[PDB]
Amino acid sequence: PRAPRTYSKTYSTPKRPYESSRLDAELKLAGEFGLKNKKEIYRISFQLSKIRRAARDLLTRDEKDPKRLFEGNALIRRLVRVGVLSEDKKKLDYVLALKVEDFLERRLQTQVYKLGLAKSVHHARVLITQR
Amino acid sequence: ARGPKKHLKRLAAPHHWLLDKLSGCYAPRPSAGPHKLRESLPLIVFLRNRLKYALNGREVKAILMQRHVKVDGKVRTDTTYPAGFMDVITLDATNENFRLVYDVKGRFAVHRITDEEASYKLGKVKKVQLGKKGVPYVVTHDGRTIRYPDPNIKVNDTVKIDLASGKITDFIKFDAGKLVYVTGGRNLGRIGTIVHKERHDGGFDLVHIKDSLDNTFVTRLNNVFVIGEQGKPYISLPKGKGIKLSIAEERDRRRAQQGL
Amino acid sequence: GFPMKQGVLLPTRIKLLLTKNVSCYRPRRDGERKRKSVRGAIVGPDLAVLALVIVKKGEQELEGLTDTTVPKRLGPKRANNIRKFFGLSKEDDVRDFVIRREVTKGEKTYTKAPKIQRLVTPQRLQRKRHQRALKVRNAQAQREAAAEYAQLLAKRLSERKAEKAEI
Amino acid sequence: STELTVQSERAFQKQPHIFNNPKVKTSKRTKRWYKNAGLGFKTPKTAIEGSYIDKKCPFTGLVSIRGKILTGTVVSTKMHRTIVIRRAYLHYIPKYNRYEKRHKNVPVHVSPAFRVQVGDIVTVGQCRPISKTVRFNVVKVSAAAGXXXXXXXXX
Amino acid sequence: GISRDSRHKRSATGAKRAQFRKKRKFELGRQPANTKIGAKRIHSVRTRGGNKKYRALRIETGNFSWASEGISKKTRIAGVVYHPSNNELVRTNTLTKAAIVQIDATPFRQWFEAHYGQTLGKKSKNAERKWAARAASAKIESSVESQFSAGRLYACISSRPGQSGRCDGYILEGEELAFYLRRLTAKK
RNA sequence: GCCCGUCGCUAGUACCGAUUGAAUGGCUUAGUGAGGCCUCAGGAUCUGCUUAGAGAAGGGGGCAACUCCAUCUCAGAGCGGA
RNA sequence: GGACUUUUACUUUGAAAAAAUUAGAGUGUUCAAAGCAGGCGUAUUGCUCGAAUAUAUUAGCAUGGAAUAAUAGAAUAGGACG
RNA sequence: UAUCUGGUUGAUCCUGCCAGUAGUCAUAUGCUUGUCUCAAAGAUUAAGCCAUGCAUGUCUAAGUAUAAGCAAUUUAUACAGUGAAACUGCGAAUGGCUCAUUAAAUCAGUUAUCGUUUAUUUGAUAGUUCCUUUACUACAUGGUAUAACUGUGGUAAUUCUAGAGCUAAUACAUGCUUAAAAUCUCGACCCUUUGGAAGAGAUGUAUUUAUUAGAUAAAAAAUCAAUGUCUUCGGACUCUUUGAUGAUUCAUAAUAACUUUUCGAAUCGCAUGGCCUUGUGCUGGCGAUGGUUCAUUCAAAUUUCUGCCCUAUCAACUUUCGAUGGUAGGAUAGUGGCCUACCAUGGUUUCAACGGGUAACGGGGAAUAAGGGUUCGAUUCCGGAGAGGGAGCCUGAGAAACGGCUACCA
Ligand SMILES: [Mg+2]
Ligand SMILES: [Mg+2]
Ligand SMILES: [Mg+2]
Ligand SMILES: [Mg+2]
Ligand SMILES: [Mg+2]
Ligand SMILES: [Mg+2]
Ligand SMILES: [Mg+2]
Ligand SMILES: [Mg+2]
Ligand SMILES: [Mg+2]
Ligand SMILES: [Mg+2]
Ligand SMILES: [Mg+2]
Ligand SMILES: [Mg+2]
Ligand SMILES: [Mg+2]
Ligand SMILES: [Mg+2]
Ligand SMILES: [Mg+2]
Ligand SMILES: [Mg+2]
Ligand SMILES: [Mg+2]
Ligand SMILES: [Mg+2]
Ligand SMILES: [Mg+2]
Ligand SMILES: [Mg+2]
Ligand SMILES: [Mg+2]
Ligand SMILES: [Mg+2]
Ligand SMILES: [Mg+2]
Ligand SMILES: [Mg+2]
Ligand SMILES: [Mg+2]
Ligand SMILES: [Mg+2]
Ligand SMILES: [Mg+2]
Ligand SMILES: [Mg+2]
């Protein structure tokens, strides 16, 4: 008898199971940004899934509707605030757009490489984890 | 279920107490008294969760059992004393004087008041009757019983109270156009002058309200507390003066006050 | 070992339902009863032990009984009870007629005494005093608030007369 | 339903604490009592005129009406001084997003201060538990008969 | 024991209803006092929430009031003569509310032949004034004065003797008396 | 070419079936009826209130006459309680 | 305050409305699952934002609507107003 | 977050199911297993059975202390510090577990008490107690009977207990009291009028009964019976007073009485002071426990409207031994066929009664993501039921209690 420690999981695994094309693309994305799982991709594309979802749902509501404005602007400002969404396309018909790579390009893994400091994505992995 | 319940689980506990989910499994169960369970504020919540004056519960019993706190006049030695709306929590030491009053969010707020406003109180006369030996009386929402009141004193009126003695020093009727603090509903906390009473014989009389921001709304007469004249209040309201800014209004205000 | 119980007759044993205040049962809970066995009130050879009580002393002193006397442990603790173990009339002052028990602290021999309850003392008279006082006081107070209201209503009626006169 | 007799029981029938003094030469023999129920259902003239007792009458009885006020279209009067109405409605099933014809039969008490036949729409109001099943009592007849005398013989 | 619930009992459709929970004290009932006559013998009972109820097995005297005379006296209760619920209560001379009893009569005579100075059936100065101010106001009534001749007045009970330990009532009169008389003799 | 039915072997499932077959559970007639509760009684003991005697106390205030309250102690008697 | 009121369905808005769940805002638990925290200086004797909003439907109450679909009304005139 | 793929033919295109595919706050099991945080867990089967231990007891300056208890000191020759045992008081009805029965029951949203109980908390509330009423009733305080204890005992055995000897109270059982005023009844006298009167009793609260007030829907009169205040003695009465609700016989009050008479402080702790007619007079500070009636608060009990899974291989059900209604009582805390008595023949049903099945507690909810749906909820919160099966009950404010008792079955 204590408050239920809540949770929820953080990934969405592939509908189809053995799709060559998608597998290729996955292994690519892993091999660029230095990831170990396909799950590390699943998780990402899932966050993407929910986000784009509420985007659609907001965009069915009427323009200049209270919810649409509050949560729309909130979502946008949030996305940008960590640097995934472009300042230019700052009105959520491009948050509906987006894509996965754009999400990937914000990882500490990656940034610790983009500005040198590692010269190798895997060196990024190991350096990061090693204090 | 064979008798009365003497425990209170968390999550059962009224949300307007603002307790956190973990940290245990129960909350303090309000005792019996002046204010109803589902709409009060036990001394321990206040002295621990609102003021952060004591860290434990043990320390609240420690403080209390030394008569530092006194309620509406008297001392009170009940960790879970049911303190509620319109009351007065005095700290004799520390020099501090509190009136228990609601937010706009509908929560009980800490609110610092004067040494002198802490000498009296306001009580909505919930009932007015005739008693033994002819003595009429009036009884107020905090369970005050006052013998011999002004015959003009009805039901749904409000009343200024000595605290020093008991007696009523002045009373405000329930008329079209009078300052009203809403106790209960979603519009609990808002304050808005009164437009007009929808009668409805037999059940649930309605009260039409509008604040000083030309916004309207409606609540049961049940949940209406007469507190004065347009602009002229009879006690020190708290910040925000119960006006209810929109989600947008508060996103802008809270995020305009941003310069360091 | 089962005990007897006065007035059950029957030279046998039976199983009665017992209560508070009754022989051969001390309860364990407020309004508890147990049904227990009992031996009758009619003597038989089934009896391990008779328990008897002298009422007339015969013609020969039994050794460890009519040769020895043994005190009654305690003495009178209540006001009048003392006054009736000495017969004093509510006059001769209790305080010194009480029973004082000696006992040694090795070389510090002490003497201890009861606590004469229901003794008449100044403090109790002060309390009686304040009772009656508080009563009359609040009574008068009531009368006066009552009058005050009476006026209130009377010179409210005066106001209705004035208002009814205005038109 | 009653009709006739009034004093037709093993017990004497009368209103409670309504002393009529015999020493005084009254013109109406029996002093009567009554009220109006509230909410605006005129305590009909048949009640004050009448001679009956029924301490379950909402106007001459000692049973107060409060709570739900319902209407319903009477379908049973075979029970002395009480009747059964069939209140009808349409119930909404979500899956099909439609309605089905439903109904329930409430037994109500009815003071003889109303004459009723089957067909007449009625307006009843909740009172205390009166019988095992009677939780309501008759307060207005929003009808009359439904043209029975306009169903007469020939020219 | 006796449970005044409605969880026994068929539904109004006559369906048969299942044991749901056992018997509880709060829905209980207790047995009849079946109060009788002679030698006051009352036993309290520990009702719910502290509170006594006074259950009166056997009574003899009761407080009976002359409704249209302004008084109330105490009298030996004679017997019970008529009862609308059950004839047995009559043969068994049981006392319950609304039982038709007979009473002493003589106290109401001692009061009447004092306050009125008229004497039923068949000297002081102030007194003269009183008895003088009181008449055409002393026609009494036929049947009532008749019962006064009998020595035995018909009255109706009002109290619940198996609840309050009391036996109280009002003398029969007028239409009520008319009723219980016509019943008294069309069963005589 | 396909393919149908009896017949024959192996294995599995269900069905009918003497035994008025068997078992479990839930209601229930009739008969029997523990126990607490209520009530009429009972009276192991154990005191009340009233009536009177005998031995002494304490005085409402007198020179003899006169007289209340409480308290203990046994032959003996009326009206109730535990 | 008196005197009376044809019955309904739909729909609107709203009152009444537990928390935890869920959708969701704020906040960088080092991330995240979460949590309802925390954030500012004179970090020597305090300053301070919070602890939102949304759903909550069937029924019941309350309120606007008068389309769509019913229901009742005057024909042996026992009609309508005064 | 709106997809399909294999398998019927020589080939084909359909119908169609099998298999594949994905997730499961969905169990299990096999293989493997390094770090952080998080952390469900004897539900399903068998509400089957249980060894041992523990899970309910509790004290303030303030009810009871002659421990033959410890401490001694610090004023205490009645008590006083501290305090075992015991008495008294309160609690043990919360909690925790389980989900067996339960299918209009529970539960849910929504009503009801003008239909009841209520420990406690908080706010109020009490001058009335005696008696033929001057030779008075303890009020400066009335009664014993009990544990513990001491001592004598019994049984193989238990939270078994007997006989004897003491003694406490906020236990048990009693029992005094307080101002004024008024209104009611009687009424000794005196005197004839139009009539008045010394003074005698009664009148706290509660209980029971009968009667009465409690107005108001706009305004005026004559007369019978009583009968109130003021005479400018034909006469007048003028001002006249009223609560709450949609709604009452409501709150509230008055009259005649009723009652093995409810309550109306025989309690406790810290201080000790004023004040003269110097009585240990007469008063008096803070606050504790109580106490009747009212209100509150925690509750409870019933209760209105609507909503439940499959089933016709269940179509009629309901009164044997209440089924539906009426009158009266009895019972209850209280309404009510809850029960009894008499009286009647009613109540439900194809708009599915009634019966059956549920590997059925109801909800908040969970899972599955076009939507509409489909499946699930024993299980952290709410509500309910039970404690191996039943039934019965004592105590109490509160239980049909089971870490309570009594009986039956096992
Ligand atoms: Mg508490
Ligand atoms: Mg209401
Ligand atoms: Mg004492
Ligand atoms: Mg009938
Ligand atoms: Mg009997
Ligand atoms: Mg078998
Ligand atoms: Mg038997
Ligand atoms: Mg689809
Ligand atoms: Mg093939
Ligand atoms: Mg071929
Ligand atoms: Mg199990
Ligand atoms: Mg000592
Ligand atoms: Mg519990
Ligand atoms: Mg004794
Ligand atoms: Mg009946
Ligand atoms: Mg009843
Ligand atoms: Mg029927
Ligand atoms: Mg089940
Ligand atoms: Mg289910
Ligand atoms: Mg469940
Ligand atoms: Mg199960
Ligand atoms: Mg479990
Ligand atoms: Mg139980
Ligand atoms: Mg078991
Ligand atoms: Mg049990
Ligand atoms: Mg156990
Ligand atoms: Mg238990
Ligand atoms: Mg057997």
Swiss-Prot record, chain A:
Keywords: Cytoplasm, Isopeptide bond, Nucleus, Phosphoprotein, Ribonucleoprotein, Ribosomal protein, Ribosome biogenesis, RNA-binding, rRNA processing, rRNA-binding, Ubl conjugation. It comes from Saccharomyces cerevisiae (strain ATCC 204508 / S288c). It is found in: Cytoplasm; Nucleus, Nucleolus. Its main location: cytoplasm. One of its GO terms (molecular function) is structural constituent of ribosome. Component of the small ribosomal subunit (SSU). Mature yeast ribosomes consist of a small (40S) and a large (60S) subunit. The 40S small subunit contains 1 molecule of ribosomal RNA (18S rRNA) and 33 different proteins (encoded by 57 genes). The large 60S subunit contains 3 rRNA molecules (25S, 5.8S and 5S rRNA) and 46 different proteins (encoded by 81 genes). Interacts with snoRNA U3. uS11 interacts with MPP10. Component of the ribosomal small subunit (SSU) processome composed of at least 40 protein subunits and snoRNA U3. The lineage of its organism: Eukaryota, Fungi, Dikarya, Ascomycota, Saccharomycotina. Present with 106000 molecules/cell in log phase SD medium. This is Small ribosomal subunit protein uS4A. One of its GO terms (biological process) is translation. One of its GO terms (cellular component) is nucleolus. The keyword RNA-binding applies. The chain holds residues 2 to 132 of 197 of the full protein. Belongs to the universal ribosomal protein uS4 family.
UniProtKB/Swiss-Prot annotation, chain B:
The modification Phosphothreonine is found at T114. GO terms for cellular component: 90S preribosome; cytoplasm; cytosol; cytosolic small ribosomal subunit. Keywords: Cytoplasm, Isopeptide bond, Phosphoprotein, Ribonucleoprotein, Ribosomal protein, RNA-binding, rRNA-binding, Ubl conjugation. One of its GO terms (biological process) is translation. Gene3D superfamilies: 2.30.30.30, 2.40.50.740, RNA-binding S4 domain. The keyword Lipoprotein does not apply. Present with 573 molecules/cell in log phase SD medium. There are 2 genes for eS4 in yeast. PANTHER family: 30S/40S RIBOSOMAL PROTEIN S4, SMALL RIBOSOMAL SUBUNIT PROTEIN ES4. Belongs to the eukaryotic ribosomal protein eS4 family. Component of the ribosome, a large ribonucleoprotein complex responsible for the synthesis of proteins in the cell. The small ribosomal subunit (SSU) binds messenger RNAs (mRNAs) and translates the encoded message by selecting cognate aminoacyl-transfer RNA (tRNA) molecules. The large subunit (LSU) contains the ribosomal catalytic site termed the peptidyl transferase center (PTC), which catalyzes the formation of peptide bonds, thereby polymerizing the amino acids delivered by tRNAs into a polypeptide chain. This is Small ribosomal subunit protein eS4A.
Swiss-Prot record, chain C:
The keyword Methyltransferase does not apply. The chain holds residues 60 to 226 of 236 of the full protein. Component of the small ribosomal subunit (SSU). Mature yeast ribosomes consist of a small (40S) and a large (60S) subunit. The 40S small subunit contains 1 molecule of ribosomal RNA (18S rRNA) and 33 different proteins (encoded by 57 genes). The large 60S subunit contains 3 rRNA molecules (25S, 5.8S and 5S rRNA) and 46 different proteins (encoded by 81 genes). Interacts with snoRNA U3. uS11 interacts with MPP10. Component of the ribosomal small subunit (SSU) processome composed of at least 40 protein subunits and snoRNA U3. Component of the ribosome, a large ribonucleoprotein complex responsible for the synthesis of proteins in the cell. The small ribosomal subunit (SSU) binds messenger RNAs (mRNAs) and translates the encoded message by selecting cognate aminoacyl-transfer RNA (tRNA) molecules. The large subunit (LSU) contains the ribosomal catalytic site termed the peptidyl transferase center (PTC), which catalyzes the formation of peptide bonds, thereby polymerizing the amino acids delivered by tRNAs into a polypeptide chain. Present with 66000 molecules/cell in log phase SD medium. The keyword Glycoprotein does not apply. GO terms for cellular component: 90S preribosome; cytosol; cytosolic small ribosomal subunit; nucleolus; nucleoplasm; small-subunit processome. One of its GO terms (biological process) is translation. It comes from the Eukaryota.
Swiss-Prot record, chain E:
CDD domains: Ribosomal_S8e_like. The keyword Phosphoprotein applies. The modification Phosphoserine is found at S65, S68, S72, S85, S142, S143, S146, S149. GO terms for biological process: maturation of SSU-rRNA from tricistronic rRNA transcript (SSU-rRNA, 5.8S rRNA, LSU-rRNA); translation. Pfam families: Ribosomal_S8e (PF01201). Its main location: cytoplasm. InterPro entries: Ribosomal_eS8, Ribosomal_eS8_CS, Ribosomal_protein_eS8_euk, Ribosomal_Se8/biogenesis_NSA2. It is found in: Cytoplasm. The modification Phosphothreonine is found at T61, T106. The keyword Transmembrane does not apply. It comes from the Eukaryota. Keywords: Cytoplasm, Phosphoprotein, Ribonucleoprotein, Ribosomal protein. One of its GO terms (cellular component) is cytosolic small ribosomal subunit. Disulfide bonds: none annotated. NCBIfam families: eS8. Present with 15900 molecules/cell in log phase SD medium. There are 2 genes for eS8 in yeast. Component of the ribosome, a large ribonucleoprotein complex responsible for the synthesis of proteins in the cell. The small ribosomal subunit (SSU) binds messenger RNAs (mRNAs) and translates the encoded message by selecting cognate aminoacyl-transfer RNA (tRNA) molecules. The large subunit (LSU) contains the ribosomal catalytic site termed the peptidyl transferase center (PTC), which catalyzes the formation of peptide bonds, thereby polymerizing the amino acids delivered by tRNAs into a polypeptide chain. Belongs to the eukaryotic ribosomal protein eS8 family. This is Small ribosomal subunit protein eS8A. It comes from Saccharomyces cerevisiae (strain ATCC 204508 / S288c) (Baker's yeast).
